[PDB]
Amino acid sequence: MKPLPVLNQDTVIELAREGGFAFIPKLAGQRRIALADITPEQRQRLNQLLNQTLPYAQEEGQPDSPGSGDQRYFRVQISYYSQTLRSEIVLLIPETSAPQALVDLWKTGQVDE
Numbered sequence: 001m002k003p004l005p006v007l008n009q010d011t012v013i014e015l016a017r018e019g020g021f022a023f024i025p026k027l028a029g030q031r032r033i034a035l036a037d038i039t040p041e042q043r044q045r046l047n048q049l050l051n052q053t054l055p056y057a058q059e060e061g062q063p064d065s066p067g068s069g070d071q072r073y074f075r076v077q078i079s080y081y082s083q084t085l086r087s088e089i090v091l092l093i094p095e096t097s098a099p100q101a102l103v104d105l106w107k108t109g110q111v112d113e
Contacts, residue, residue, distance in 0.1 A: 007043065008080075010036055011080055012033070012035060012081075014077045015032075015077070016030040017075070017106065018073060021068070021071075031109075034079075060107065063099070073094045
């Protein structure tokens with residue numbers, strides 16, 4: 001088993017949602033976090049922060065919640081640089097098919113299990 005690349009000093013998660021019908025800033029919802037662009041403490045505090053916010057935040061509205069737009073899609077780009085494996089992984093799939101991993105990656109951004 002080789003689960004997703006755990007958040008390390010060489011991990012970079014970047015997710016962005018687009019689609020709908022009209023190009024509107026509010027429909028951006030972009031989130032690019034690069035651990036390699038911050039300090040060790042900053043990373044740990046960041047992960048713990050967001051995670052600690054989950055139980056302190058509202059509830060999710062199913063893998064695909066209602067709203068405006070006609071064609072929505074999620075784009076998750078996981079950039080991981082290791083010794084044996086050094087590359088990035090981009091995934092783009094419509095919201096209508098957005099798996100729990102996608103909806104969870106944009107919300108928590110942590111390995112699903």
